[PDB]
């Protein structure tokens, strides 16, 4: 792959996408979940006492470039998972781009869900205002400042398990074979350390299920999680029923449904009918949208596997376009 190109792996039914990162000298390959909703780079280490045996573990002793650090860290995600450990410094190779002396966070403890998943840790791609430890420069900060990328951007392509899965991240460039038409520039509000946008409205057919709302673009969240009222309004349009846990039961046959269309800055972005169904387990289908007790939405993979995004950290802004499929 070209410079800064990282081929992704689609886990399950578009649950998550992870790529290979080489850390240390001589270096080991790690499978990290690329997350635009967090800014801490953490990995399973040999200091970990409740880590998966299936996970690949960073071993300080085998990296001739490891530098010890006196600080500790602890994190807690929105789905309730967590991890904690110590800070350190080493080299990280992101698609042929060698980031020298990056602050990596080595896990001493991790939630079981982490221990049982396909990931060795996470790559945080949100702004540095939300790093859990103050003064830590995120990978994107180091690429820029080390001149590894000329444009302060990353192009994101998330594939669909139904079409073979895959995905691709490109640091400092993008790929037009992956999208159709022209890109639309949308300004970003990073005042909370996230990639925040304003959706002008949402429609199902001719009905306005929602008016403007704010959402964060999170590559690390599976569904489209919407405020309670918006969520309920969408559900009524599809005849989905509330499971009482942030999820909905929808009909497995989406052939009859209309796409959920989002009017963002003048253009139309959608959640195609197939995408309205997340998973089917023993004949019951769980919808691709959920609800949370938040005032903003979490624009997760359900949406991203349908639209190509160019994340610009410098302005900041994003450029979006419908996936070529």
């Amino acid at each position: 792959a070209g410079v800064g190109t990282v081929p992704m792996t689609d886990y399950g039914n578009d649950i998550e996408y992870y790529g290979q990162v080489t850390i240390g000298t001589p270096g080991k390959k790690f499978n990290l979940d690329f997350d635009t909703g967090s800014s801490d780079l953490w990995i399973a280490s040999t200091l970990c006492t409740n880590c998966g045996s299936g996970q690949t573990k960073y071993d300080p002793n085998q990296s001739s470039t490891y530098q010890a650090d006196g600080r500790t860290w602890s994190i807690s995600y929105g789905d309730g998972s967590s991890a904690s450990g110590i800070l350190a410094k080493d080299n990280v190779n992101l698609g042929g781009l060698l980031i020298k002396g990056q602050t990596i966070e080595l896990a001493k403890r991790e939630a079981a869900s982490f221990a049982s998943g396909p990931n060795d840790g996470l790559l945080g791609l949100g702004f540095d205002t939300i790093t859990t430890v103050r003064g830590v420069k995120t990978p994107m900060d180091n690429l820029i400042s080390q001149g590894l990328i000329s444009r302060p951007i990353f192009g994101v392509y998330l594939g669909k398990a139904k079409n073979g899965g895959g995905g691709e991240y490109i640091f400092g460039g993008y790929d037009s074979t992956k999208f159709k038409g022209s890109l639309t520039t949308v300004p970003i509000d990073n005042s909370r350390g996230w990639w925040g946008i304003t959706v002008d409205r949402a429609t199902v057919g001719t009905s306005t299920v929602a008016s403007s709302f704010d959402g964060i673009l999170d590559t690390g969240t599976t569904l489209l999680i919407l405020p309670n009222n918006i969520a309920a309004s969408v559900a009524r349009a599809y005849g989905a029923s509330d499971n009482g846990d942030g999820t909905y039961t929808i009909s497995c046959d989406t052939s009859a449904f209309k796409p959920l269309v989002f009017s963002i800055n003048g253009a139309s972005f959608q959640v195609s009918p197939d995408s309205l169904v997340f998973e089917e387990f023993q004949g019951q289908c769980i919808a691709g949208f959920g609800y949370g007790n938040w005032g903003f939405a979490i624009i997760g993979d359900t949406f991203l596997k349908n639209n190509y995004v160019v994340f610009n950290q410098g302005v900041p802004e994003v450029q979006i376009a419908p996936v070529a499929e």
Partner: peptide, 5 residues
């Protein structure tokens, strides 16, 4: 489903 902060 995941829900990464």
């Amino acid at each position: 489903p995941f829900h990464x902060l």
